[PDB]
Design a protein around this motif. Sequence first.
Motif, short mmCIF file in Angstrom:
data_model
loop_
_atom_site.label_atom_id
_atom_site.label_comp_id
_atom_site.label_asym_id
_atom_site.label_seq_id
_atom_site.Cartn_x
_atom_site.Cartn_y
_atom_site.Cartn_z
N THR A 6 11.21 3.76 -8.71
CA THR A 6 11.63 5.02 -8.11
C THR A 6 11.84 6.16 -9.12
OG1 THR A 6 13.81 3.97 -7.98
CG2 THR A 6 12.54 4.17 -5.95
N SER A 11 9.59 8.60 -3.29
CA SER A 11 9.85 7.64 -2.23
C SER A 11 10.12 8.31 -0.89
CB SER A 11 11.05 6.76 -2.61
OG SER A 11 12.18 7.56 -2.89
N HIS E 44 14.00 -3.17 -7.46
CA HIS E 44 13.12 -2.01 -7.54
C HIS E 44 12.42 -1.91 -8.88
CE1 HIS E 44 15.41 0.35 -4.16
NE2 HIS E 44 14.78 -0.72 -3.71
N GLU E 122 11.44 1.23 2.16
CA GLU E 122 11.36 2.38 1.27
C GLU E 122 10.02 2.23 0.54
OE1 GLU E 122 14.64 2.62 -1.46
OE2 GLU E 122 14.17 4.68 -2.01
N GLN E 123 9.08 3.13 0.81
CA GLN E 123 7.75 3.08 0.20
C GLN E 123 7.56 4.26 -0.74
OE1 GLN E 123 6.23 0.30 3.49
NE2 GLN E 123 4.66 1.69 2.69
N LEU E 124 6.73 4.08 -1.76
CA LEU E 124 6.48 5.15 -2.72
C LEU E 124 5.09 5.79 -2.66
CD1 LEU E 124 7.89 3.48 -5.94
CD2 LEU E 124 9.26 4.46 -4.09
#
Lengths: 18, 18, 18, 248, 249, 253
Positions: A6, A11, E44, E122-124
């Motif tokens: 992230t 995101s 993550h 939660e995607q990027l």
Amino acid sequence: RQTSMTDFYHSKRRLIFS
Amino acid sequence: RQTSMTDFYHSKRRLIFS
Amino acid sequence: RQTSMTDFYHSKRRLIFS
Amino acid sequence: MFEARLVQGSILKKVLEALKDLINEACWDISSSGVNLQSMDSSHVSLVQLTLRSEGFDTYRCDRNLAMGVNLTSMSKILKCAGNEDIITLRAEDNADTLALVFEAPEKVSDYEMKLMDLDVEQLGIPEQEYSCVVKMPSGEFARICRDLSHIGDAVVISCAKDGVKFSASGELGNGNIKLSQTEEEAVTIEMNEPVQLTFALRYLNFFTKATPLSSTVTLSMSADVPLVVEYKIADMGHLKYYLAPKI
Amino acid sequence: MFEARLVQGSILKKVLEALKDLINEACWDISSSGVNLQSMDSSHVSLVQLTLRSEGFDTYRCDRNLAMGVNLTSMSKILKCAGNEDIITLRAEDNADTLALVFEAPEKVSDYEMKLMDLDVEQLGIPEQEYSCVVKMPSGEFARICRDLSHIGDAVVISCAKDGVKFSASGELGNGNIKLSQTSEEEAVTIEMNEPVQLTFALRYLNFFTKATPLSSTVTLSMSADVPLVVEYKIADMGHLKYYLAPKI
Amino acid sequence: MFEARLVQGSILKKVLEALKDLINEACWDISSSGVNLQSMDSSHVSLVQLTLRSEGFDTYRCDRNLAMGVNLTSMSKILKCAGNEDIITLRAEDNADTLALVFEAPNQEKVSDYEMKLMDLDVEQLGIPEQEYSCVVKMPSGEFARICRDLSHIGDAVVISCAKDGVKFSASGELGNGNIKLSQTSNVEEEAVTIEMNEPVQLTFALRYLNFFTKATPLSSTVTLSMSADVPLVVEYKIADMGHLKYYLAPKI
């Protein structure tokens, strides 16, 4: 220092109903 | 409800010496 | 009773510095 | 005096590997007819019945009938000392508290002397029945099914009909269902007098399956409200039967 | 309604065994293009992205796009029930809370119905990039390397240049250094390097990526300075499976 | 400076899988003659003696003798990173605190360089003079392994009785007793059980220890046991063409 994904990419959160 | 083998067949107790 | 190798042979101690 | 010689020692190795985990102690009845063993596991939910006909042995001798209280765990540790090619000879005396097993490498000769024990066994009178459903199928196939449905749930519902048998399971992840249709050691055949549908605990079945190496096939005999009978025919020795009490 | 058929059951088995341990829950987006999945591990620190092209399936149908919240651990148990020669069929209803997998023995047909779930995913957004260094090497070689350096240290310093690539670790017993050279098809090591790169990555995560080895004879590592590493496994004529790993420092 | 090149890396891989569990720390004496190791396990009940002759190395050089204190556990981890077809080179500097292990993968496409840190050890080595034992049994290492593992299920100790025509191993426990008899074989070679006896012997040993020695089984097709009354047993694995690996085990009583 371990970084996280992230920190490099934008995101967008998603709610999955199933 | 788990039944037991003794519920279906006649048992006969045995004393084994050896 | 368990014997130890040192009961049969002569022992000499060595200090290794590496 | 009892002395039985078996060239195929592997059979005896296999039998114990197929029992030690289900039953820890058991009485071995030796007669001129052969070796017989019937025992119930601790929970009394399943029962084992082993038969090794005297004719299956290369040599067999039993003057007087014996009832040897054996610790299967211990006998199993002893058989693991035999190779798969060894000739196994069992020998016991009438007033003896021990069993003697002699392994002959096909220059190595091994002799073990297993202590026996006292056992307050309880045996069941199981009459010959003609079951409503008898399924013959590959033992490996049966083993797969049990192992798998186990990941899905605790119990298995076996439904037997003329043109096929069905195994089902259910759990928090969903449900599983395997359908086998009636198709030598790769066929599936059903002798169904009446359809049957039973519920059994997969835990016990995955113990029975530890006998797969005894046969290329296994038979399942079912009838409503009676214990399932899973049989592994030990090739020209006799057989090994596992009985499983149904769930409610 | 969705219904895809895969004659090669193994592909899906291997795909799931390669993911289940790194990611437990993940959304499976089904679309006419095929199956797509992007998910980050709990910390993550890594990301996975699966793509199974519809053209890779013998049969493929998808009336409306589906986003099924799936528990990879449960689906793994279900797929464990398939044989390496089974034909796997996937079938799902638009308004359905379950996924249906059907295994066909190459007269044994298994039919499972896996319960789905809700997932706050939660995607990027990962844009196409061209990396400073791109190493193609045998997946077996990659897995051996990562595992070996694990007995020496926690992180691996990958140095990529035009002549070859070098993996190194350091620990309380000494250090290790594995140098691969460009080779003069599946046993080759080739390097499309633009600029040299030297990155530090956690071996713990790389040993998870290497569980995707059975999926391909080769793996390709894409490294650009200051960006996450990309270890890609091309699933033969299906698509691919990629693992991203956040660099250290 | 010391540098030895062993084309057969696998040997050095096997040597360490056969030692690590019995001995965690040991001194590696290096000389023109080769590499030698003598070490007792923590309890001092067993002793290992390794000898890898210089003639067994493709390239061997030693300007000055070294006594490298090594952590065999760590050297095992490092050697696990070698392939069985890897060419293994060992290079150490005289005033050095490290040992350098370089593995060369067959095609020259992969090269590995490890730098293992050495350590200080307060070693205690014994003086074992050449003897002539009462009994020497040559037999299959696979067979010895089997016998040891098996009798371990039956008991803790094993009574090895050696006589002219055969050697017998025996174990006793709560479940009963076991007894294995090997008869001297005529015209078989690795499958032979040949004996050399000056006089019958019968000794007792702790099986837990013997099952550690059998970890050196991959080193040789055969294994020879030498015994004599009231003295430590010697199980030796000849590391073909290199030298050998001997394990001594103190008897009971």
